[PDB]
Design a protein around this ligand. Structure first.
Ligand SMILES: O=C(O)C(=O)Cc1ccccc1
Ligand SMILES: O=C(O)C(=O)Cc1ccccc1
Ligand SMILES: O=C(O)C(=O)Cc1ccccc1
Ligand SMILES: O=C(O)[C@H](O)Cc1ccccc1
Ligand SMILES: O=C(O)[C@H](O)Cc1ccccc1
Ligand SMILES: [Ca+2]
Ligand SMILES: [Ca+2]
Ligand SMILES: [Ca+2]
Ligand SMILES: [Ca+2]
Ligand SMILES: [Fe+3]
Ligand SMILES: [Fe+3]
Lengths: 339, 335
């Protein structure tokens, strides 16, 4: 029953108030996550705010503030010095990486909406986001949302892989997990980020797989320029998650897919997964994330293909699509099994 | 806490979209959108992006963000005011303050809460943005009570000083109302002074109104003491909370008393900390003001705390005005 055009002054006051407080609740969700509060609430159902502030060595008045902000829209409920989980807790906590993405990750971009929209201002470094924050969030996003379909696609391969290349390798947590599934397999991540390489080289070393897995600086759109080219010949599983839209526009993508094909000519399966642009979802029925993903990419000047556009580009790219998975609850997100 | 899993999905999605709405309101304001919607009730997003020279797809996003929570309604490339437009638009400066002025603060909630980090410049805000909003906040929420206090002063001022003079607009208006008056602005920010002086000069009040850098907390250090002695009306809006904690406010009030010994009336308007409002009935702003200041480590007195400090501070409160509708806000007439 949402969609009315006619409301009382009471309702309108209340609604504009909730929009205001949601703003704070929404920033608080990502913050509370990162400070270990959501976890503890998930684990114990309850928490004493004073004891929290002490244990974690936090300024207590703001801690009160963070919880009151979560309480203002029903994520938690306050009783005395106690915070309990609220009716909206599980849902919010579930999607906690998405709010973090929105606020801590991408907060600056959306804050400067009045400066980002005007054309004259659109060149060089016309926006900023917190790459450490994004990273921190995209890690849980990849796990909470993409893993099931990722693992499902891995199950239905028809072969044990021997050498896997992961594009947008990042933390290396995709490749690390591969090694753990397929004992003897070798890994190879590719990342534009200098910092992601060392974070990954460190990550790998720490988890047992030092001589199994290595990384390289490089960019899918010019993967043929990359000096490790010669070793791509032995790769028989390729993977690429949450960056496919940055291959776009279409012709870039076609080319990028063709290059990928030639550069990895013994790849049997290529697992590609990403969120896509939605179409025709009504303004007042938008689910979590959708609006921020699409809006932020518009504000960054970055094109987002629809599912159909992905469908329409693979044959041209030199790939056959043999299986597709829908992601649960992250806009219209998908995993394609290509060969 | 008994709701369906669909209830919870929808509520959580509203919080998320609300975030983007909220930021959008101040954006829309600043870019002319809200005003063009108030005047005509409609707008064409292509037309509007073109005239304003904006990247259209971001413009659409911005208007979708607003429609996602009922502020506006989209019908093609036509944007129409929605059920919550009047109210949103009314409080637009407050959303601006939260987002454009103070977004960097609340964003870094994880880095700002831990005590170890809390030294030096531990948070950042956008002084230009904040100033932009404070202008309207002053005018939409404080002015009615402000002018009512001016109307019942029982004297006609001859020299007025305004602490946190900002853009100079308070002193300007005072001059438009009392032509003979001299005006004196105290602001701690060089850039407030520069703006105000420029603004005062352009409008022709450059010979009546002038400015000095100073912190009202240390008003006794501001070496323009002779001009201060001539002042018979003192104004201070939206910063009294910054005189607290209590001991500090007592001292500041006593120094203000001394620095302006011929002030007859002293107008002090501020928002104050609320008490016992239920979490799910917090009105607009309250949570922002209070939570933001707890994050900045700045004390907020209650009303009663203010009422109980003036005598020790060297003043007698003779009149008090309630404000609509800015958390619990107030104007004291002190003497
Ligand atoms: O931040 C970005 O640029 C993204 O595109 C983030 C993203 C992509 C896919 C799923 C979730 C987030
Ligand atoms: O010095 C002057 O310019 C004035 O006459 C003062 C003034 C100018 C313009 C409007 C009101 C007062
Ligand atoms: O921004 C601050 O730190 C303020 O104190 C802002 C303010 C004070 C009183 C009313 C509205 C905003
Ligand atoms: O067009 C599609 O739907 C996807 O590109 C993948 C796919 C195609 C055919 C059968 C299954 C999956
Ligand atoms: O105590 C109060 O309510 C205010 O400090 C000011 C006031 C006092 C007495 C009569 C009127 C106003
Ligand atoms: Ca309804
Ligand atoms: Ca029109
Ligand atoms: Ca800032
Ligand atoms: Ca009282
Ligand atoms: Fe992206
Ligand atoms: Fe303040």
């Amino acid at each position: 029953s949402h969609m009315s055009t006619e409301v009382s002054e009471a309702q309108a006051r209340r609604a504009v108030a909730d929009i205001f407080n949601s703003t704070l609740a929404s920033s608080a969700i990502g913050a509370a996550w990162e400070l270990g509060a959501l976890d503890e609430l998930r684990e114990n159902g309850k928490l004493d705010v004073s004891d929290f502030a002490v244990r974690h060595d936090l300024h207590e008045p703001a801690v009160v503030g963070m919880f009151t902000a979560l309480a203002s829209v029903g994520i938690v409920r306050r009783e005395g010095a106690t915070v309990v989980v609220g009716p909206y807790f599980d849902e919010a906590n579930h999607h906690r990486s998405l709010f973090h993405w929105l606020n801590q990750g991408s907060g600056e971009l959306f804050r400067r909406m009045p400066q980002v929209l005007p054309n004259e201002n659109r060149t060089g470094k016309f926006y900023q986001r917190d790459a450490g924050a994004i990273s921190y969030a995209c890690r849980e996003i990849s796990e909470r949302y993409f893993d099931p379909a990722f693992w499902a696609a891995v199950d239905g391969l028809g072969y044990t892989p021997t050498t896997v290349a992961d594009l947008g390798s990042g933390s290396g947590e995709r490749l690390i997990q591969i090694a753990r599934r397929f004992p003897g397999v070798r890994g190879l991540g590719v990342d534009i980020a200098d910092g992601a390489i060392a974070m990954a080289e460190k990550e790998v070393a720490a988890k047992g797989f030092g001589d199994q897995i290595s990384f390289v600086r490089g960019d899918a759109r010019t993967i043929d320029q990359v000096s490790a080219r010669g070793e791509f010949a032995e790769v028989d599983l390729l993977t690429c998650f949450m960056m496919g839209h940055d291959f776009w526009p279409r012709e870039n993508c076609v080319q990028t897919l063709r290059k990928l094909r030639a550069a990895f000519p013994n790849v049997r399966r290529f697992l590609l997964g990403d969120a896509t642009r939605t179409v025709g979802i009504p303004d007042r029925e938008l689910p979590v994330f959708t609006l921020g993903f699409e809006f932020g990419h518009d504000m960054m000047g970055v094109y987002l293909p629809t599912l159909d556009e992905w469908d329409g580009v693979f044959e041209e790219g030199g790939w056959r699509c043999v299986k597709k998975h829908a992601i649960d609850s992250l806009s219209v997100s998908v995993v394609f099994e290509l060969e």
